[PDB]
Curated annotation (Swiss-Prot), chains A, B:
Places the protein is found: Cytoplasm
GO cellular component, one term: cytoplasm
EC identifiers of the protein: 2.3.2.6
GO biological process: protein catabolic process
Family: Belongs to the L/F-transferase family.
Stored Pfam families: Leu_Phe_trans
Record-linked InterPro entries: Acyl_CoA_acyltransferase (IPR016181), Leu/Phe-tRNA_Trfase (IPR004616), Leu/Phe-tRNA_Trfase_C (IPR042203), Leu/Phe-tRNA_Trfase_N (IPR042221)
Protein name as annotated: Leucyl/phenylalanyl-tRNA--protein transferase
Length: 231, 231
């Protein structure tokens, strides 16, 4: 029952109508305007499409997700992290992180210049945030996403140095949990997310979770740029 | 006799010693740091000055105020709001609302890059909030201010489409009242504000209200970003 968004309205169809195959494809067209996106993440919808294609909106079923508590950290990583060679900051360099994500010529191929601006825009308005991983003064990895109350919608992550990506995710989760963070939406499950504790749950439930958590809150300063981890 | 603020501390002089004409002129100098700004609102003072001049602080007598309940709404406006073409949201795009007021070419000329950054910190820190009015996908109005308990200090409004500004206030007041909102600071009274039902109580009366409402509280999640009204 695919819907064709217009320049006019900013309203999305109901997730229930999403197609089974491809999984969750709900609507195409529209723009990546703050109001539109912010409206979409609020309803459990998210944009994803390959360069050259029109904007595609999804709300897959089942929905991959990560319980902060359940993050799985190997014994080796913990040893590594006990004596971590990195530093971790919050919203210190959103632009660089989303850039490194597009860099990786794979999962980040969809992150096009326009995609980068739409999200940078959210970060600038206080909704899209990033976790940066440093080695010296160099940014070696990180991750960004869109906060939805006590729920965090992961957008992507990148790594240019062994375990940088896990450090960011690791430390994020700790800060997140210690302050009220309830969930992490991973959208679609994959080997990486799976090897981390991401698990599927019915769309029907993710929407319940979403509706509840989007009205919750963390300390005011929680998303204020700062240092999260440093030896 | 007209105190100069010192960078050393965040202390302000009694408002009762403000000038009688220019009405409210109390002190100049200081800075626009969170600590200071918050202290000003805490004690019934607010900064205002045109580009070029030093920081000027005020606390006029009388003070313009708006009883959330006594908001005057014409019959054509209700007629219009019933079939409203706008969408109202809270703290979705503080940055843009403030820039919108800051560019209303007439009054918002005092809102400089400096002032914007200053209030943006308070928003980032969670004391400043904004009400956006959307027409489809575009921002056509809004309003921002500083939350002082059950009291709310209005800083500015801006409109790009008929009745946008009024919708913002309308929707706000309803919500505001709904959860314990008690008063809306209007700083100085003017034609528009007065047509909306704002009045004037003595500086000392307003100051009392300030103390009572400062401690007064609203639901813990009152300001979290969210839609307040769908067309
Ligand atoms: N098809 C697709 N849709 C969205 N995001 C995608 C896609 N393909 C790759 N990505 C991004 O690349 C990373 C690779 O790890 C993906 O990570 C995820 O599984 C995210 N959907 C959720 C998440 C992001 C950051 C941190 C934790 C979870 C994805 O972001
Ligand atoms: N001197 C002065 N101080 C503040 N704001 C001023 C001033 N002169 C003009 N303005 C702006 O013009 C509008 C006129 O309606 C003012 O709006 C206000 O009522 C604000 N002062 C307070 C307020 C903000 C939002 C919602 C309700 C009240 C102001 O923007």
């Amino acid at each position: 029952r695919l819907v064709q968004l217009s320049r006019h309205s900013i309203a999305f169809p109901s997730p229930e109508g999403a197609l089974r195959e491809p999984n969750g494809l709900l609507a195409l067209g529209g723009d990546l305007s703050p109001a539109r996106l912010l409206m979409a993440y609020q309803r459990g919808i998210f944009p994803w499409f390959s360069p050259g294609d029109p904007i595609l909106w999804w709300s897959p079923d089942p929905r991959a997700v990560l319980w902060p508590e359940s993050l799985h950290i190997s014994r080796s990583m913990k040893r590594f992290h006990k004596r971590s060679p990195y530093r971790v900051t919050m919203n210190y360099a959103f632009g660089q992180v989303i850039e490194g994500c597009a860099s990786d010529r794979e999962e980040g191929t969809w992150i096009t210049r326009g995609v980068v601006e739409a999200y940078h825009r959210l970060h600038e308005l206080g909704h899209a945030h990033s976790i940066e991983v440093w080695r010296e003064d160099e940014l070696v990895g990180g991750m960004y996403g869109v906060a939805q109350g006590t729920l965090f919608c992961g957008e992507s992550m990148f790594s240019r140095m062994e375990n940088a990506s896990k450090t960011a995710l690791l430390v994020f989760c700790e800060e997140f949990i210690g302050h009220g963070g309830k969930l992490i939406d991973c959208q679609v499950l994959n080997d990486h997310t799976a090897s981390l504790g991401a698990c599927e749950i019915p769309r029907r439930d993710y929407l319940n979770y979403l509706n509840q958590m989007r009205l919750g809150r963390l300390p005011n300063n929680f998303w204020v740029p700062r240092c999260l981890f440093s030896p």
